[PDB]
């Protein structure tokens, strides 16, 4: 089995269109996703809520729907509720917040996809394993 | 000679049967005390609260307990690190509860047992001997401290401290590799080392003394008889015990100086030991063993599993059922 | 004054010589990628 | 003594080093050149990073049977495409 | 009659840098098998067919997670010689079915034969007593009741230890959950046996190191000692004394001491050895059935023998699908027996 | 080659700094020598830790133990403990590092150049070994020197900037400290404590004032001991007490520096004071706190009354009290309510965590606060993955506060071994018995049976 073009292939937006990430886009998302992410998201589960996983499944029914490249990118600007009632840029880590969140500080837009490609792409890979948590390590 | 002077000389006495000397000042209440209350404690003492969620665990042999099950339970997890002695408790049956004993216990025995350490050192002085045995009992002796008093602290509370029975060591230890990993880390793994080291080069120097024991018995008689206590001359041929095993491996593979054979004999299970104790007492403060979970990773990015990622699920068994109605939140964090 | 070709050397070859040849393989293995 | 040369003699001598200073390396690189033309992969049936799976599947091929265990082995390496 | 026979006695005796003898003939091909098996296999042979795993650096692995595995469950109790009806003389196949693991075991077991005539032939060529090779006896009952009657017992060879560091941990934790092998007196004598000879080794070196006689002018005291010298480098009367002071008894001959260091971690390693030999049947010591009863009956009961069973159960239920590939268990979340929270 | 083999100084090669006993010329060089390696390690450590630190990453994600030091001190580091300016850092690892170049070149040159002993060069820097008056002068030399470097401290904390203060108002800054504690019923009150747990001994000093005071308090201390041990000579009850060696001076060191090692090691593992949570990352108390912290937010957020909710075991799932009544977190840290934080102390009452401020009173900083010391409580592996045992590879952490603790306990365990080894020996040098025992004269025999 191999890291192929349709692996990397995601939804970029709601209406359909797909884009096509690179190898090199996938590993810089894993390592920016590590840097800035991994402390709480560590193999798509959430430490300190972990009613909410990184799913595609659960990503697709959030509102507005976060199962795309452009959803997630507008999710780590301004993040809200799973309803999308609130906005929680205050606890959690956004372009936003970037003065209280200092990591994100030196997150550009390009980084923002990466990462989010990555997201998308690990439970093509990893199946179940991806938000499961310790019953599938 | 006044009285004070004739009480010195008789606890430094060397012709006391057992010596006494200012180590045994201490080390005989304290050893006593510790004693008693174990005793008593493992024979009628009422179950504790080992884990402060009102969840008493039998511990004595009156309340159910073979000589295999039972032990004195580990105090509160209420209590943590706080003293407990039996004058801050409202009454003997509180103190009980909460598992006072485990606490008198241990404070008496590890005092006692590092006097006992001391005193070894000091009878060597009184009878001209050079003085370290008492470093080679250091080993075992750091290794008590670092399951009942520095796992402890670095964890916050007594109740993790290994309780004292024959089944309550053996949950210690599970625990203890849910947690931490023990047997992925290289402190423990150098203690087994030491210990399977210890037990090889014992009965080596046993087989090779005893099979160069010089003839002084007829077949009829034990060949102990062979040697007499205080007798000048050895009682076994050291040019022969190396000429067969210099042979058995290589000449240079053999000693043949019996002061550096003894010295190895002692340093190696002693050193083994002491990495042993400096695993529980770093592994006390969470520097665990090697984690590589998942470490092996194919080209599209599937999980490869090893041997490690199998002691994990092993590990994770034992982490989700471990003191099972004592966590409300997700992570064990201690 | 002394043999080169003894039951030691055999001993000595048949241990060194593979253990060489399994290094350089188990270097070369530190580059490989996935 | 046994008879045969002292170490220390035979790792000093410069003859000893003539010979090990080209035999040493010459081994070394043919290690590292049975895993870097990947025979030891075919040698021992060991599979490289891209072929432990398909790339759809997520099952082990693990060998079931006793005496056809060898024909399911072939089985499963075709199936690789 | 000096015939071909006695030429060959007489050369395979020969005072050399590493002795020979009949028994090398034996020792001598199987151990360096056994030993370049170890090593082929941890260096470059998968157990992906047989175990689902990665186990050679080749593929990742480091000196901790290498192994030579034991074969498929589907093997049986198989020799699986190379030339079998398994492998069909394929060495690639013989590699990918396990092979590799009855080889090192099978020829490791007459490896041990070996290096025990050899203790008896230099013994009797030298004129000591043979207690090395009697001592030797608890490291093969242990090696045979492990690798080759434990697996005889269960269904296959892939119960069997796997040679590799963390395979053995593994192999340690499997005993616990699913044997509850702490609990078994034949194990207890076992771990008294080798810390007690431990221990015995350690006291035993530094009571000799400190009860030395100043036989030289030196600060470093290991050169006073001359190997053919008749007097005893150390006090015996001196560390009696010590002894009985501090502890309150004390060995006074030195040959008793010495045949009980001999005496202490043999006999463990046997007793070791019979309870595996009960685990090859399951005959486990698991239970105590009043224990069980009494639980059963009281909710309020509980010890912490009722409290490492719930540990064993942790054990079994979350590591035997992957740990058994070939039983396809399939455990759907909701029966996973776990606590609160965790 | 004076007392350089075995046969002339009766030391072997293993134990070749036996020889330098009685030789102090060699023996100030291999102490500069030594000093210059402490002060190499320094500078250098630091400006490895310089090249490698990114500023918008707390430090204790970057495996910094001395930059940490530095910030503690108040260089480099504004508000809440953000990086400002990273030169302070660079000075002091330079500084540092040019130094042990003189140290280092004048261990070399006493070393093998210069004079071997030094009684015939200069009275002033020989010495005895049992020259009881010399011995205490030149540890009253080094006792004002140990003085002047606490007051040094204090002049930092009250003159050049202050100390960083993690319990200042408004989230943690540098203030200089103008009230130290002087009242020596406090400062000395803390060496009467119970080490226990509640009480922590010294460890639990959890203010800037008193830690500026007790260094005031230590430094004149240091400085009168200093002079009293010069102008006087070991009164006869301490002559007869001790043993009187090098070998056995060197003992009673190792076995002060193991008890300050294993201080250390509970002042790092406990104290989030003068170890600052922002630097180190928080205690492993604190990240606990902080988990049921961060779940008793969640859930009262989503509308759990979380003062009457009861756990499965019929004891608060979020809230308990302390067995002295304290409204204390739940769970299984329940062990920790000693704890005392900035992000937490807010919401404590007269008795305990206050159920109205809990309802009311939480800001979106100790949620935030929360979240990041439950997300990096001190656990990993060897290799540096963060987290439980259990966890996957992916998050490259071990807290700092792990780092120090382990690596002094490991320093203070085997000093206290080097204490017993030098203390037996010294005693049995003096005595005249570590060689072994006179055959003919082994002192077993000349006593009466025992039995
Ligand atoms: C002391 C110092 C010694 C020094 C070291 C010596 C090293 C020598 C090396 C010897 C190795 C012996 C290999 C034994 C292999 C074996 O046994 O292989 C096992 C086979 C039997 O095969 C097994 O048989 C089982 C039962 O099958 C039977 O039942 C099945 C299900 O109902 C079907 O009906 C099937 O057709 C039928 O055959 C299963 O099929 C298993 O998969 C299959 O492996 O027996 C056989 O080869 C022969 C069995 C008879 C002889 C057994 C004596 C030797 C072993 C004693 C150990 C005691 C073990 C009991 C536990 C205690
Ligand atoms: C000459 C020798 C003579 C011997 C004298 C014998 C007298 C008794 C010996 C001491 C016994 C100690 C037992 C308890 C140790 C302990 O619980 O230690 C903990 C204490 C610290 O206490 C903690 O201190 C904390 C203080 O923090 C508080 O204050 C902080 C301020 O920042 C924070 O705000 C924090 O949140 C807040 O809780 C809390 O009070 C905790 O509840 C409390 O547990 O350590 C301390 O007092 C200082 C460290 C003491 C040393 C630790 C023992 C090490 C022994 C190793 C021996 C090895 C032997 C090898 C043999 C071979
Ligand atoms: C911090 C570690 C340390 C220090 C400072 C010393 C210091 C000393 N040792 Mg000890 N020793 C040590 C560790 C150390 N040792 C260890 C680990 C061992 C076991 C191997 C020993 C075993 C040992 C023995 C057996 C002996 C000593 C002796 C000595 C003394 C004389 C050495 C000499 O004359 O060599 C001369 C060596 C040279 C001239 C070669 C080069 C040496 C220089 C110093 C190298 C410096 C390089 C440096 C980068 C240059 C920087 C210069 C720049 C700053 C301008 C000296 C005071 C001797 C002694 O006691 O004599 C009375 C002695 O016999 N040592
Ligand atoms: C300030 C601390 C200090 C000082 C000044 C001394 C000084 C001395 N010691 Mg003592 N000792 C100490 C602490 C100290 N010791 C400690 C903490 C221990 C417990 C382990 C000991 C245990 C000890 C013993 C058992 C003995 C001495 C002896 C001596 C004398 C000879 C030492 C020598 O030449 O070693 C030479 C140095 C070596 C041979 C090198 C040792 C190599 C170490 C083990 C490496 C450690 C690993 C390293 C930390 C990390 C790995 C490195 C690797 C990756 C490259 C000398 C007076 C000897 C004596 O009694 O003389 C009177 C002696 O027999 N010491
Ligand atoms: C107080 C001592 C101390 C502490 C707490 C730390 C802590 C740290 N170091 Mg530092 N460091 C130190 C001393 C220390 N170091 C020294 C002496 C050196 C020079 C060798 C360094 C040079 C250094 C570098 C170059 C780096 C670090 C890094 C780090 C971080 C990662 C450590 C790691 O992964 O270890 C891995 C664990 C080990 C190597 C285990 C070692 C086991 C030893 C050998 C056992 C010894 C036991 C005992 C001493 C011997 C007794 C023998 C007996 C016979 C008596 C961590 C914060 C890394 C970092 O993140 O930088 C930002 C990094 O890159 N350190
Ligand atoms: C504690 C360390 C120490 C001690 C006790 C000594 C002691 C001695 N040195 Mg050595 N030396 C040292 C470190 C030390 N030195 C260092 C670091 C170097 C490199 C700079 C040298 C290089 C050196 C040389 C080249 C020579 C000596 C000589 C001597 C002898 C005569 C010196 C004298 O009378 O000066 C009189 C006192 C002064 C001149 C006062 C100097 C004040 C200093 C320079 C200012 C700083 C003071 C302050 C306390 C420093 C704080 C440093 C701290 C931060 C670490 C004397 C035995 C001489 C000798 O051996 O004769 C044969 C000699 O020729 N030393
Ligand atoms: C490194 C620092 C240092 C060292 C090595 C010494 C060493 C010495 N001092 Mg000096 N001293 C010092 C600093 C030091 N002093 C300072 C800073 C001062 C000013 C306060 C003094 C004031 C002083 C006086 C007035 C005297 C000495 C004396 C002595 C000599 C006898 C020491 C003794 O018997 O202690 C043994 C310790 C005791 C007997 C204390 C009582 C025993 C208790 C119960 C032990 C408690 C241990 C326990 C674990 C404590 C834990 C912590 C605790 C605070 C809770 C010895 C040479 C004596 C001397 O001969 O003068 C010339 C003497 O009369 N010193
Ligand atoms: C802990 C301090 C966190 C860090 C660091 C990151 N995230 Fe997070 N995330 C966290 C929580 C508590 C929640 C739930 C928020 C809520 O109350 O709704 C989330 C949620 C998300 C989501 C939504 C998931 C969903 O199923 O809708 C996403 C997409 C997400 N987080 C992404 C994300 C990224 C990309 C991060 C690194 C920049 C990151 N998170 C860090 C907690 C924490
Ligand atoms: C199997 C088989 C076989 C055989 C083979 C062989 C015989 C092989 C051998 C092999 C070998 C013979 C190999 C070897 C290798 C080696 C190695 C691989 C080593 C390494 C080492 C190291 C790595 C080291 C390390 C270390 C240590 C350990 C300690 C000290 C220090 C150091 C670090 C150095 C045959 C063909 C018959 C048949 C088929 C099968
Ligand atoms: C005696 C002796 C010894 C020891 C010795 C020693 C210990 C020494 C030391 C030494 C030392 C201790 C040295 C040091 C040196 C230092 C130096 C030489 C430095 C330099 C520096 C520099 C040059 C800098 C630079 C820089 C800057 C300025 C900026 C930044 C960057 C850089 C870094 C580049 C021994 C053991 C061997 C043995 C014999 C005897
Ligand atoms: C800084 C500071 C502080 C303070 C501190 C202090 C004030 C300290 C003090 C300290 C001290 C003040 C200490 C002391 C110590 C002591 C000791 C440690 C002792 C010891 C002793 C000994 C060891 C002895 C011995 C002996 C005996 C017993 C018998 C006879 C003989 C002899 C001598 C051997 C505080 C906390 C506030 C805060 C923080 C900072
Ligand atoms: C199996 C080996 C049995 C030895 S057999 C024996 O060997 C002799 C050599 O000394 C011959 O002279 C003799 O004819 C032969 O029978
Ligand atoms: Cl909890």
Same mark, same amino acid.
């Given at each position: ?137 | ?7 010195? %000389? ?5 012709? %006391? ?26 024979? =009628? ?19 159910? %307990? ?14 943590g690190l706080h003293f407990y002695p039996?004058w801050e ?18 404070? $008496? ?32 002796? =750091? ?10 602290i670095?964890?916050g ?20 590799? =849910? ?5 992925? $880390? ?101 520097? %665990? ?32 059922? $471990? ?10 964090? =201690? | ?34 | ?81 | ?178 044997? *509850? ?126 409290? *490492? ?30 606590? *609160?929270?965790? | 080659?004076?007392? &350089? ?20 010329? /060699?023996?100030?060089? +291999? ?12 500078? #250098? ?11 918008? /990453? ?10 940490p030091h530095?910030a503690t001190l108040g ?6 403990g ?7 850092? @660079? ?21 093998? &150049? ?9 009275? @002033? ?18 006792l004002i020197v140990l003085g002047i470097g606490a007051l040094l401290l204090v002049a930092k904390a009250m003159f050049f900037g202050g100390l960083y203060d993690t319990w200042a108002p408004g989230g943690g800054d540098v203030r200089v400290i103008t009230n130290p504690t002087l009242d020596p019923r406090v400062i000395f009150g803390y060496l009467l404590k119970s080490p226990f747990g509640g009480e922590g001994w010294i460890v639990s000093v959890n203010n800037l004032e008193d830690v500026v005071g007790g260094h005031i308090w230590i430094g004149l201390i240091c400085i009168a001991g200093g002079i009293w ?8 009850? +301490? ?17 002060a520096?193991?008890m300050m090692g294993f201080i250390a090691t509970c002042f790092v593992w406990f104290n989030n004071t003068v170890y600052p949570s922002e630097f180190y990352?928080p205690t492993?108390p604190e +990240?606990?706190q ?32 302390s067995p002295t009544g304290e409204?204390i @977190? ?6 920790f309510w000693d704890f005392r934080g900035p992000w937490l102390e807010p919401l404590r009452g007269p008795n305990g965590l ?14 935030? &606060? ?6 990096? #409580? ?23 506060r792990?780092?120090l603790a382990?690596?002094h306990?490991?320093? #203070? ?17 003096? +005595? ?20």
């Open positions: 089995a191999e890291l192929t073009p349709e692996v990397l292939t995601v939804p970029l937006n709601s209406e359909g269109k797909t884009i096509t990430l690179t190898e090199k886009q996938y590993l810089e998302g894993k390592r920016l996703f590590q840097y800035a992410c991994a402390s709480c998201h560590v193999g798509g589960i959430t430490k300190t809520n972990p009613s909410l996983d990184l799913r595609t499944e659960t990503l697709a029914l959030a509102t507005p729907p976060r199962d795309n490249i452009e959803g997630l990118v507008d999710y780590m600007k301004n993040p809200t509720t799973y309803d999308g009632e609130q906005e929680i840029a205050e606890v959690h880590p956004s372009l936003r917040s970037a003065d209280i969140f200092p990591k994100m500080r030196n997150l550009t837009e390009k980084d923002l996809v990466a990462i989010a490609g990555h997201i998308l792409v690990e439970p093509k890979i990893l199946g179940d394993k991806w938000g499961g948590g310790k019953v599938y390590y | 000679a006044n009285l004070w002077e004739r009480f010195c %000389n008789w606890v430094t006495s060397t012709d %006391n049967r057992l010596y006494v000397g200012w180590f045994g000042v201490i080390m005989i209440p304290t050893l006593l005390a510790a004693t008693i209350c174990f005793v008593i404690a493992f024979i =009628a003492a009422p179950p504790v609260d080992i884990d402060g969620i009102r969840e008493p665990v039998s511990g004595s042999l009156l309340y159910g %307990n073979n000589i295999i099950t039972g032990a004195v339970v580990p105090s509160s997890n209420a209590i039996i408790a409202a009454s003997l049956d509180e103190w009980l509860y909460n598992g006072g004993p485990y606490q008198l216990i241990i404070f $008496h025995f590890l005092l006692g047992a590092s006097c006992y350490m001391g005193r070894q050192w000091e009878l060597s002085y009184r009878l001209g001997m050079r003085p370290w045995i008492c470093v080679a009992y250091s080993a075992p002796l =750091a290794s008590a401290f670092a399951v009942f008093l520095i796992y402890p670095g964890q509370s007594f109740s993790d401290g290994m309780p004292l029975g024959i089944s309550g060591t053996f949950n210690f230890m599970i625990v203890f590799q =849910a947690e931490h990993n023990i047997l992925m $880390h290289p402190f423990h793994q150098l203690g087994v080392a030491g210990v399977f080291g210890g037990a090889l080069f014992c009965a080596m120097h046993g087989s090779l003394v005893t099979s160069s024991l010089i003839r002084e018995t007829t077949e009829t008689e034990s060949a102990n008889y062979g040697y007499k206590f205080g007798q000048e001359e050895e009682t076994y041929n050291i040019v022969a015990a190396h000429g067969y095993f210099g042979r058995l491996i290589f000449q240079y593979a053999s000693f043949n100086n019996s002061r550096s054979l003894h010295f190895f004999l002692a340093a190696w299970p002693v050193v083994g030991v002491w990495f042993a104790a400096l695993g529980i007492s770093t592994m006390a403060f969470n520097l %665990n063993g090697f984690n590589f979970n998942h470490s092996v990773i194919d080209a599209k990015g599937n999980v490869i599993n090893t041997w490690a990622d199998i002691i994990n699920r092993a590990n994770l068994g034992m982490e989700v059922m $471990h003191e099972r109605n004592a966590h409300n939140f997700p992570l064990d964090l =201690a | 004054s002394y043999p080169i070709f003894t039951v030691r050397w055999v001993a000595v070859h048949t241990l060194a010589v593979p253990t060489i040849f399994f290094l350089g393989a188990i270097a070369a293995m530190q580059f490989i990628q996935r | 003594t046994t008879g045969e040369r002292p170490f220390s003699d035979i790792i000093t001598s410069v003859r000893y080093w003539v010979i090990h200073s080209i035999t040493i390396p010459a081994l070394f690189i043919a290690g590292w050149l049975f895993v870097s033309t990947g025979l030891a992969y075919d040698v021992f049936g060991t599979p490289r990073p891209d072929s432990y799976y398909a790339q759809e599947q997520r099952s082990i091929p693990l060998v079931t049977d006793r005496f056809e265990a060898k024909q399911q082995v072939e089985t499963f390496l075709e199936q690789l495409k | 009659e000096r015939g071909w026979f006695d030429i060959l006695d007489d050369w395979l005796k020969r005072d050399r840098f590493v002795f020979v003898g009949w028994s090398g003939i034996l020792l001598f091909p199987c151990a360096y098998l056994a030993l370049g098996g170890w090593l082929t296999g941890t260096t470059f042979v998968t157990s992906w067919y047989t175990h689902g795993l990665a186990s050679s650096y080749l593929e990742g692995c480091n000196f901790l997670t290498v192994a030579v595995s034991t074969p498929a469950n589907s093997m049986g109790h198989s020799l699986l010689l190379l030339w079998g009806p398994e492998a069909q003389g394929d060495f690639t196949r013989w590699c990918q079915l396990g092979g590799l693991w009855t080889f090192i075991a099978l020829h490791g077991a007459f490896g041990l034969i070996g290096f025990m005539l050899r203790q008896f032939e230099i013994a009797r060529l030298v004129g000591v007593r043979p207690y090395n090779a009697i001592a030797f006896s608890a490291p093969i009952a242990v090696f045979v009741s492990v690798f080759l009657i434990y697996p005889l017992g269960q269904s296959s060879w892939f119960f069997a230890p796997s040679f590799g560091v963390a395979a053995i941990f593994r192999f340690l934790l499997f005993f616990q959950g699913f044997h *509850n092998w702490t609990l078994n007196p034949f194990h207890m004598m076992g771990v008294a046996g080798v810390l007690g000879g431990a221990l015995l080794c350690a006291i035993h070196g530094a009571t000799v190191e400190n009860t030395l006689f100043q036989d030289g002018e030196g600060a470093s005291t290991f050169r006073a000692f001359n190997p053919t010298q008749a007097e005893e480098t150390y006090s015996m009367v001196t560390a009696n004394r010590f002894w009985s002071q501090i502890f309150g008894i004390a060995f006074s001959n030195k040959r008793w001491l010495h045949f009980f260091m001999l005496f202490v971690p043999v006999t463990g390693l046997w007793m070791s050895a019979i309870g595996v030999v009960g685990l090859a049947l399951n005959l486990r010591s698991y239970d105590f059935i009043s224990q069980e009863i009494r639980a059963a009956e009281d909710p309020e009961f509980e010890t912490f023998y009722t409290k *490492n069973l719930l540990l064993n159960e942790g054990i079994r239920a979350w590591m035997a699908p992957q740990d058994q590939p070939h039983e396809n268990f399939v455990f759907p979340e909701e029966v996973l027996p776990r606590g *609160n929270a965790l | 080659a004076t007392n &350089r083999d075995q046969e002339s100084s009766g030391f072997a090669w293993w134990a070749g700094n036996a020889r330098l006993i009685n030789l102090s010329g /060699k023996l100030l060089g +291999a102490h500069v020598a030594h000093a210059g390696l402490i002060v190499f390690w320094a500078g #250098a450590m630091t400006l490895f830790e310089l090249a490698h630190f990114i500023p918008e /990453k707390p430090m204790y994600e970057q495996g910094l133990i001395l930059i530095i260089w480099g580091v504004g508000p809440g953000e990086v400002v300016d990273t030169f302070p850092f @660079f000075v002091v690892g330079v500084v540092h590092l040019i130094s042990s170049a003189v140290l280092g070149f004048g261990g070399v040159y006493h070393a093998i &150049r210069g004079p071997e002993t030094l009684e015939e060069y200069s009275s @002033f820097f020989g010495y005895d070994w049992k020259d009881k008056n010399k011995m205490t002068t030149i540890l009253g030399f080094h041990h010069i102008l006087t000579t070991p009164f006869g009850w +301490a002559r007869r007490a001790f043993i009187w060696s090098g070998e056995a001076y060197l003992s009673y060191s190792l076995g520096l193991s990352g492993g +990240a606990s902080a988990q049921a912290m961060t779940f008793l937010i969640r859930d009262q957020k989503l509308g759990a009354n979380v003062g009457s909710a009861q756990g499965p075991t019929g004891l608060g799932k979020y809230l308990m009290r409204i @977190f739940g769970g299984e840290t329940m062990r206050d159920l109205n401020k809990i309802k009311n009173d939480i800001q979106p900083w100790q949620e935030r &606060r929360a979240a990041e010391y439950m997300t990096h #409580a001190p656990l990993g592996s060897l290799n540096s993955v963060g987290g439980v045992a259990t966890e996957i590879n992916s998050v490259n952490f071990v807290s700092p792990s780092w382990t690596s306990f490991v320093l #203070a365990f085997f000093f206290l071994v080097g204490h017993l080894w030098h203390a037996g020996r010294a005693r049995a040098a003096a +005595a005249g018995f570590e060689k072994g025992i006179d055959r003919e004269s082994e002192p077993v025999l000349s006593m009466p049976s025992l039995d």
